[PDB]
Design a protein around this nucleic acid. Structure first.
Ligand SMILES: [Mg+2]
Ligand SMILES: [Zn+2]
Ligand SMILES: [Zn+2]
Ligand SMILES: [Zn+2]
Lengths: 183, 107, 97, 157, 280, 540, 96, 85, 103, 171
RNA sequence: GAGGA
């Protein structure tokens, strides 16, 4: 835990410490342009579609949408939008290859101008990990850097055990007395 | 060696290159009131003869253009009176070796 | 990620020439292009798989080379040509004297 | 073209691999087959050395033998050998050596001396129609002189 | 900027530093041929101190009583007293040392005895001592000639350049001058016998090692000292966090320093902020 | 990979620069561009034999690039050319044009000041073609007449004649005698009659840079790859900025030809001429001072060529002196006191991605077979088999994944494994020390973890810093690393000839306390401490 | 674009764009190696077209019409833009 | 012209770290390419390890060439080079 | 004397903060600044308009104009410097890349 | 036309062949790829003389690929066409607009416009030959061929022969 | 925009 930060109690994390929710919204709409070029929402197939995203179209329904509450991941398509060639090629919207989560709420509406258009929100829980960054209220940026189970942490006679150990070398150089005083 | 105390009629300056092969050099008297070469910062410069120059150029396998240079107008160049092309050897006290010798060609 | 120029210098000060070259070519954008031995430009019309090369403009068909360069370099040269400067590339020390 | 207009690779100064100037060397159908087989002799000579530790038939029957000696895929070399035998008309190398000594006496550029040996004609005019190089460099009478001397040596083997 | 300027200055196999066009920048890298990683401060023990102290430390006299060394430390200590074939040698090398004293005192004007140098003698000394657990009661098995000639031959063997012509030879001589001064200071006969008291065999080990390490410490041709120097100058400049000038304490010297002054230097600027002119 | 070629493979050793003969340009081009219609032959979004590949570079994943056809991805793109109605300046050189014209007869074209003048006699002898030209122009900047004949009086072909005081406006040169705008074509001819010698005697070169080449008459058209067409929507493809600029130059040139053969209202001609000149100018440089900027239908000016190269992410500094490379990764770092000084804890998932190509020898063939058995997921596995002739095989799609048998000389792209050297830097990098080599230790938990003493060289702290890691791809690359750039080699820095690493905060603080005189250690703890030393001989 | 090894006339291939390759999903051979990502007035007879465009645009503004309607009308005008069956018609009738 | 006689080689008898590095690199590269090996491996498998061994007993017969600034050169071969390092 | 003073100045600057840099580095820098016989700055219009390689000079500053002067003077750049070899992506004659074993 | 020539070749030797007997494979490849090959610069390289004394001086290891690069100088004999030259020959196959005369190692074609008018083409004949007022010129016929054009393409030389002139057609 | 450091 030296050279800043620090050790965080693993068990205490399990209790729920510093957990958080993450919501991300994907937007998409029908064709912007093209009198006949008219992008449509639906579940594509091999109907000379020739631009399958190689992800996984199985999730969504016929309207090219995933019902909220479905778990997604990887690059599963969430919006099935296809474009005429004027057979029709795929212009879907997979979610970010890195992340995964639950479709939280899917909103369908028409644009200002009358274009049907869709917003999707994905929910995800983020638990503190080895590298995530934390900070006191003064200046001490810091990231985790190992987690110990409860017993391994030092414990005082009353049985209390810290959930965060920061190295003393932080203090004198910076002179954040207020940190100590607040504690 | 011409020592003038105030200045030269630049017309007279025109007559400096009058008479090859010999050469004439001018010095304002003021510039001679103190010998620069005695200064701490000026290392011993030694003009070296032509055969020496060939020897050098050969040992290091140089062409003339690859030497470090020195302006013909440079004060110690004048003090020695070099000619465009003479190579001077510079001996300086070096804190890493004590003695270090370097050469500059008189551009 | 970017192998910035200051990285280039560090890798030089180590003297690791081979690694530097590897980074700058095989890691990113090695490109092979043919070259007129006369005109010194990239104009060779390498009808490859027929071994027909024919830098016309010099009308050469025999004295021709292939080299390997960063694609971005080839691009740079084409841009120089488009700006009317010719960067002739000669594969031997021009010592005719 | 055929008027003594040859490229850099075929200038007079044919620098040998020892790095010095030398005269351009060309070969007609008076030395080609008689040097190729000779070189093949050396080839087979080493071929069996390091292994230890009319003219028509003499052409092809030994062509197959050196095809064994060589890599054998050079059957186009065999085509050249055939072309030689069909149109190379000297033997007993001293024959052509006297010929070449005479042509050295001719003061002719080696291209022209090869032109003479390669071609088998009758008059100076036939040569001038085939060799615009050889029209006036010597007296046309001397052309016919040496053409007739060749015809004296022009014996099929 | 610095990097760009010195981008391509390499040490070539003649141990001379040239840019890309081959122009010579220094005739030997850093005027010594020595690689930077193999330096360390060492002290020259002749330059400093009183004259009498110096003499007492180094003087040895086989004929007079005063600086005569006690025979005990030397196996042959008895009969040596009064000899000449060796007394001459002692005189010679002592003259050598005094010449060095004068020389250094004119090189380093103040008398700064410590200077980064190649091979650390002192460590080699003590390594020898331990490696032979030199008991400080037995007379030494050495003699004088072995000592002095050993050091001389050693000096012969500290090659930096390997030419065969007096230009190169003078270059070598100069390149290794200062280090040899150190050497002679440190291995002076009196000092060896008195303090270091090595055996003969220890002594030879020492010599071998010194030569070996010296040769080990010479810059390697092909080394990109240009970029090296560029960085080694720039990086500390970045480490000047308090950069501009701290002469609030003395306005008598509100004289530029740090990054502004450096930047002023590099672009040679005719208008210094504070052109000063000290006079003695 | 790229096909075989029989051409010799070489390495450039000299770059000869120089300007472009319009004759050469024509000799080079493979098509004359005529219509700024880009590709749609009014329909059918194939492409016109007009601009944009009248066979000068395949764009749509079909070979057919003018009988070379090369596929894409192999064609260098072959140039094309455009003929200018009226010659124009070349923005870059305008100042040099003015400087030159101030030094030559406006009719005879001979140098104004020449030669027996002694200052001239000096300037001729001086080298530094730049400085020589500087001296000459310094001289003839004042000359005004064409100096019929010379003093002892001597005679030279001076067609004595007063020559104006040139001066620059916009993209034009004005010149007063004792007034008129100096046209292009005049100056063109003037140059054409300079000499074969004197322009050299003022800097130029005979074979590569004759001054008249400083004004363009024919124009080269960089092939598509220099200006590729982004298809940022899927029915239409936004054309490259330069292509618009080219359309504009072509439009104006067409117009000028029209205005010439179809009757010449004598001074709309200039109105179009200056237009064309301006177009070319801003095309090669959109940042001419004291000018409009050629905007493009959006307010954003046009990205001229010159700005494609201007420093700091031009071509040079951004794509050549440094680029973005494969086989690398980047993450947050985290200290760790159980890592050997030179180790680095690359997290497992990364190592599942970076690869290193081994070569199948008898020494490893079994082991490599095991790896390729493992496929690309379970960690100590591989991702690609490169049979000879360079035909990679992805393992994710070989149903016979374990089946194939490696042939000596094939390559396997194994995952990273332990002790493979990798490089490690933390930008900004002001040090050879900032990049060093390390042995890999593969661990869970996505950060990079690394020993603690190594922080000072990298000048990093684990307050969220990140560092990149580079994987050498070949034998001598990694040999180079482990023999030159490995950490322990760097302990002593040449910068100050003192070690650049050392013991740091927690350990540094403790080791003092431990080593105080008051400290004493009971038995059991002593035993444990001993056992912690890996090299402890086993003696108490 | 075909697999030399597997050789099925309709080639079942996959594009591993993340690796930037194209693969014979049958045999696993890679086909193409570097995948170029792409994801981010009188001389032209469009003089009358642009006059129509400008008038159409100002009319669309006045009507508050959607950009899609504006584009559809512009496209329809471009589709006719000239005809004997048009034959003039005041250039405002066609706009409307 | 252009080489140099074997005597009057004035460069250093030792081997520079860059030489050692490139040598090992090259030799390892070759070994990986099933080049012959001139020493008895003792289960050595890592080509760099092997090359280090070969070099250790001076069995690497290798080609590149030194270079004075002018353009001349000397040729040493790993036998004659003292591998102090 | 100019060179010696220059070194003194630089050294003063650097040792001012108290940090120390080995001698040879400062010496080398100073010497580069004084080969041409005069104090050549390290700015673009200083060293960078020496006569070194065109490309090498073009990568520092004023890229395109450098290229223009070069293409006019028909300048010959010989790809011996580092930066050129970088641009060509060839092994620079550096460190690992400059030397000898031959067979 | 035949010439004795001294040629230089650069041969790449893959590392596996680095035995004590490298020169074996070296000379081997030299013969395997030089004798009987076509160059746009020297013509078909017929045979190599002095198989023993070949300058094989010194290898270079390419910085990667570890394969040694050898610069072999060797002396051999080549056959080179030239424009306007007069040769013998024999046809191989027929063409509707001329016939291809095999001039030894190479085949020289003579085109329809390249022949005298009286030399007409008979397609019915087997093999379809070319019939003059005095000569019926067939596959095995001996034609005095004059070399009009030559293609200098690397690895492939093509020659244009014509019998329109005198002393041509049958030899 | 963002922006960490
Ligand atoms: Mg930080
Ligand atoms: Zn060309
Ligand atoms: Zn005039
Ligand atoms: Zn397949």
């Amino acid at each position: 835990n030296q050279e800043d930060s620090m050790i965080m109690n693993q068990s205490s994390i399990d209790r729920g410490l510093f957990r958080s929710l993450f919501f991300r919204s994907y937007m998409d709409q029908e064709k912007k342009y093209g009198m006949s070029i008219t992008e449509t929402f639906e579940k594509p197939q091999r109907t000379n579609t020739l631009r399958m995203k190689h992800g996984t179209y199985d999730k969504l329904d016929d309207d090219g949408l995933i019902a909220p509450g479905v778990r997604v991941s990887g690059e599963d398509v969430i919006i099935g939008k296809t474009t005429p060639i004027s057979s029709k090629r795929d212009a879907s919207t997979p979610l970010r290859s890195t992340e995964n989560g639950i479709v939280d709420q899917v909103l369908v509406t028409t644009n200002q101008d009358g274009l049907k258009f869709v917003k999707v929100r994905v929910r995800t829980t983020k638990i503190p990990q080895i590298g995530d960054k934390f900070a006191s209220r003064h200046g001490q940026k810091g990231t985790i850097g190992i987690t110990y189970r409860r017993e391994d942490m030092p414990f005082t006679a009353e049985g209390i055990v810290p959930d965060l150990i920061i190295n003393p070398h932080a203090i004198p150089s910076r002179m954040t007395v207020a940190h100590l005083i607040e504690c | 060696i011409f020592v003038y105390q105030n200045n030269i009629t630049p017309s007279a300056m025109k007559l400096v290159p009058s008479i090859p092969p010999a050469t004439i050099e001018t010095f304002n008297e003021a510039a001679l009131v103190v010998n620069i070469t005695h200064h701490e910062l000026v290392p011993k410069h030694i003009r070296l003869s032509s055969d020496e120059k060939r020897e050098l150029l050969k040992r290091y396998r140089l062409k003339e253009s690859q030497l470090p240079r020195i302006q013909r107008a440079d004060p110690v160049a004048l003090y020695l009176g070099l000619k465009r092309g003479e190579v001077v050897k510079i001996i300086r006290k070096s804190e890493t070796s004590g003695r270090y010798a370097s050469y500059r060609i008189c551009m | 990620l970017r192998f910035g120029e200051m990285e280039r210098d560090c890798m030089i000060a180590h003297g690791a020439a081979s690694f530097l070259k590897e980074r700058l070519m095989e890691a990113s954008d090695a490109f092979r292009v043919h070259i007129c031995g006369i005109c010194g430009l990239m104009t060779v019309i390498a009808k490859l798989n027929h071994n027909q090369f024919e830098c016309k403009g010099c009308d050469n068909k025999i004295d021709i080379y292939q080299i390997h360069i960063p694609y971005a370099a080839k691009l740079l040269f084409q841009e120089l040509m488009a700006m009317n400067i010719t960067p002739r590339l000669y594969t031997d020390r021009s010592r005719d004297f | 073209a055929a008027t003594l207009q040859l490229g850099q690779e075929f200038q007079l100064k044919q620098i040998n691999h020892q790095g010095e100037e030398e005269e351009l060397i060309a070969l007609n159908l008076s030395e080609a087959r008689l040097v190729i087989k000779e070189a093949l002799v050396e080839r087979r000579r080493a071929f069996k050395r390091s292994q230890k530790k009319t003219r028509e038939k003499e052409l092809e029957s030994i062509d197959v033998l050196l095809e064994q000696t060589t890599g054998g895929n050079n059957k186009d070399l065999k085509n050249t050998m055939q072309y030689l035998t069909n149109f190379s008309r000297f033997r007993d190398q001293e024959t052509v050596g006297a010929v070449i000594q005479l042509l050295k006496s001719t003061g002719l550029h080696p291209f022209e001396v090869a032109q003479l040996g390669s071609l088998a004609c009758d008059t100076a005019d036939e040569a001038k129609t085939l060799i615009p190089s050889l029209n006036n460099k010597i007296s046309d009478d001397e052309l016919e002189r040496i053409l007739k001397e060749l015809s004296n040596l022009e014996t099929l083997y | 900027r610095l990097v760009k300027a010195l981008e391509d200055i390499m040490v070539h196999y003649d141990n001379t530093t040239r840019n890309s066009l081959g122009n010579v920048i220094q005739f030997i890298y850093g005027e010594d041929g020595m690689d930077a990683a193999h330096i360390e401060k060492q002290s020259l023990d002749t330059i400093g101190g009183s004259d009498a102290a110096f003499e007492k430390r180094y003087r040895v006299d086989l004929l007079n009583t005063d600086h005569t060394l006690d025979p005990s430390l030397l196996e042959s200590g008895s009969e040596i007293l009064g000899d000449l074939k060796l007394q001459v040698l002692l005189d010679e090398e002592y003259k050598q040392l005094v010449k060095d004293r004068k020389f250094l005192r004119e090189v380093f004007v103040d008398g700064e005895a410590n200077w980064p140098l190649p091979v650390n003698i002192r460590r080699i000394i003590q390594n020898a001592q331990q490696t032979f657990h030199i008991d400080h009661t037995k007379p030494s098995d050495l003699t004088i000639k072995d000592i002095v000639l050993g050091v001389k031959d050693l000096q012969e063997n500290l090659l930096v350049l390997r030419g065969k012509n007096e230009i190169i030879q003078n270059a070598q001589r100069d390149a290794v001058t200062l280090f040899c001064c150190l050497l002679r200071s440190r291995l002076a006969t009196r000092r060896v016998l008195q303090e270091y008291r090595l055996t003969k065999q220890a002594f030879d080990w020492v010599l071998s090692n010194i030569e070996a390490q010296f040769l080990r410490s010479v810059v390697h041709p092909g080394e990109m000292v240009g970029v090296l120097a560029a960085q080694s100058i720039g990086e500390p400049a970045t480490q000047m966090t308090l950069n501009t000038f701290h002469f609030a304490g003395v306005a008598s010297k509100k004289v530029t320093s740090g990054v502004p002054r450096l930047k002023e230097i590099l672009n040679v600027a005719k208008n210094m902020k504070t052109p000063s002119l000290t006079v003695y | 990979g790229q096909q075989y070629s029989s051409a010799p493979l070489r390495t450039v050793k000299e770059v000869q620069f120089g300007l472009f003969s319009p004759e050469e340009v024509r000799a080079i081009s493979v098509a004359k561009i005529r219509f700024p219609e880009t590709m749609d032959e009014t329909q059918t979004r194939a492409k016109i034999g007009g601009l944009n590949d009248p066979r000068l570079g395949s764009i749509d994943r079909n070979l057919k690039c003018q009988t070379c056809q090369e596929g894409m991805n192999e064609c260098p793109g072959h140039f094309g050319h455009i003929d200018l109605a009226k010659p124009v300046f070349h923005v870059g050189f305008i100042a040099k044009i003015k400087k030159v014209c101030e030094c030559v007869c406006m009719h005879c074209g001979k140098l104004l000041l020449d030669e027996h003048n002694e200052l001239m006699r000096q300037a001729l002898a001086i080298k530094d073609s730049k400085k020589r030209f500087a001296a000459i122009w310094t001289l003839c900047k004042t000359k005004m007449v064409c100096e019929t004949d010379v003093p002892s009086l001597v005679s030279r072909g001076g067609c004595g004649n007063t020559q104006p005081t040139i001066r620059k406006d916009g993209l034009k040169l004005v010149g007063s005698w004792k007034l008129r705008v100096l046209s292009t074509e005049e100056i063109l001819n003037i140059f054409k009659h300079i000499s074969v010698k004197d322009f050299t005697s003022l800097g130029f070169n005979e074979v590569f840079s004759r001054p008249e080449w400083m004004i363009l008459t024919c124009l080269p058209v960089p092939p598509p790859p220099v200006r590729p067409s982004i298809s940022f929507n899927e029915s239409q493809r936004g054309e490259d900025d330069l292509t618009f600029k080219l359309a504009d130059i072509l439009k104006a040139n067409i117009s000028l030809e029209t205005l010439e053969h179809n009757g010449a209202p004598h001074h709309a001609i200039e109105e179009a001429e200056s237009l064309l000149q301006f177009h070319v100018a801003t095309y090669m440089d959109n940042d001419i001072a004291g000018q409009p900027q050629a905007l493009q239908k959006s307010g954003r000016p046009v990205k001229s060529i010159r700005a494609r190269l201007k420093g700091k992410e031009g071509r040079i500094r951004g794509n050549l002196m440094g680029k973005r490379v494969d086989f690398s990764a980047r993450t947050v770092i985290s200290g760790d006191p159980n890592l050997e000084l030179d180790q680095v804890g690359v997290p497992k998932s990364i190592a599942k991605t970076l690869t290193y190509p081994e070569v199948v020898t008898p020494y490893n063939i079994d082991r490599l077979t095991q790896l390729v058995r493992n496929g690309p997921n379970e960690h100590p596995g591989a991702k690609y088999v490169i049979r000879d002739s360079g035909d990679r095989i992805d393992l994710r799609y070989s149903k016979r994944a374990g089946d194939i048998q490696l042939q000596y000389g094939w390559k396997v792209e194994r995952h990273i494994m332990d002790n493979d050297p990798v490089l490690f830097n933390r930008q900004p990098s002001l040090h050879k020390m900032s990049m060093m080599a390390h042995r890999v230790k593969v661990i869970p938990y996505s950060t990079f973890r690394l020993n603690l003493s190594v922080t000072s060289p990298y000048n990093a702290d684990f307050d969220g810093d990140e560092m990149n890691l580079h994987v050498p791809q070949s034998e001598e690359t990694r040999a180079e690393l482990s023999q030159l750039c490995a950490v322990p080699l760097q302990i002593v820095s040449p910068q100050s000839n003192k070690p650049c690493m050392g013991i740091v905060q927690d350990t540094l603080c403790g080791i003092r306390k431990l080593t105080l005189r008051d400290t004493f250690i009971e038995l059991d703890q002593v035993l444990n401490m001993l056992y912690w030393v890996p090299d402890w001989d086993g003696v108490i | 674009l075909t697999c030399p090894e597997c050789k099925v006339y309709p080639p079942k291939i996959v594009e591993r764009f993340s690796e930037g390759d194209v693969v014979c999903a049958l045999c696993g051979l890679v086909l193409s190696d570097k995948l170029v990502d792409t994801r981010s007035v009188m001389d032209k007879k469009d003089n009358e077209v642009q006059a129509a465009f400008a008038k159409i645009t100002m009319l669309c503004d006045a009507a508050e019409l959607p950009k899609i309607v504006k584009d559809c009308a512009k496209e329809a005008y471009k589709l006719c833009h000239d005809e004997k069956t048009l034959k003039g018609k005041s250039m405002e009738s066609i706009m409307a | 012209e252009k080489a140099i006689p074997k005597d009057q080689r004035a460069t250093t008898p030792y081997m520079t770290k860059y030489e050692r590095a490139r040598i090992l690199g090259t030799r390892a590269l070759q070994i990986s390419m099933n080049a012959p090996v001139f020493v008895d491996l003792e289960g050595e498998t890592d080509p760099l390890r092997i090359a280090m061994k070969e070099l250790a007993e001076k069995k690497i017969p290798l080609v590149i060439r030194r270079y004075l600034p002018d353009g001349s050169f000397e040729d040493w071969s790993v036998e004659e080079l003292i591998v102090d390092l | 004397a100019g060179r010696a003073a220059l070194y003194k100045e630089v050294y003063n600057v650097i040792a001012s903060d108290g940090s120390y840099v080995n001698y040879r580095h400062m010496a080398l820098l100073v010497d580069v600044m004084t080969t041409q016989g005069g104090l050549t700055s390290v700015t673009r219009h200083g060293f960078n308009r020496s006569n070194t390689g065109a490309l090498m000079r073009c990568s520092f500053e004023e890229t395109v104009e450098i290229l223009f002067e070069a293409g006019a003077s028909a300048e010959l750049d010989d790809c011996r410097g580092v930066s050129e070899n970088v641009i060509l992506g060839q092994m620079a004659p550096i460190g690992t890349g400059a030397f000898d074993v031959m067979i | 036309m035949f010439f004795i020539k001294d040629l230089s070749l650069n041969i790449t030797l893959h590392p596996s062949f680095f035995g004590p007997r490298m020169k074996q494979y070296l000379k081997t490849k030299l013969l395997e790829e030089v004798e009987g090959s076509c160059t746009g610069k020297f013509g078909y390289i017929l045979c190599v003389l002095d198989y023993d004394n070949i300058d094989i001086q010194r290898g270079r290891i390419l910085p990667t690929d570890g394969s040694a690069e050898f610069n072999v100088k060797y002396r051999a004999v080549v056959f080179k066409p030239f424009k306007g030259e007069v040769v013998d020959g024999t046809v191989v196959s027929c063409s509707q607009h001329g016939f291809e005369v095999q001039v030894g190692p190479m085949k020289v074609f003579v085109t329809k416009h390249l022949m005298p008018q009286d030399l007409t083409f008979n397609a019915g004949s087997n093999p379809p030959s070319y019939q003059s007022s005095e000569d019926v010129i067939t596959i095995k016929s001996r034609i005095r061929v004059k070399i009009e054009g030559c293609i200098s393409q690397v690895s492939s030389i093509h020659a244009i022969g014509s019998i329109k002139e005198d002393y041509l057609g049958a030899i």
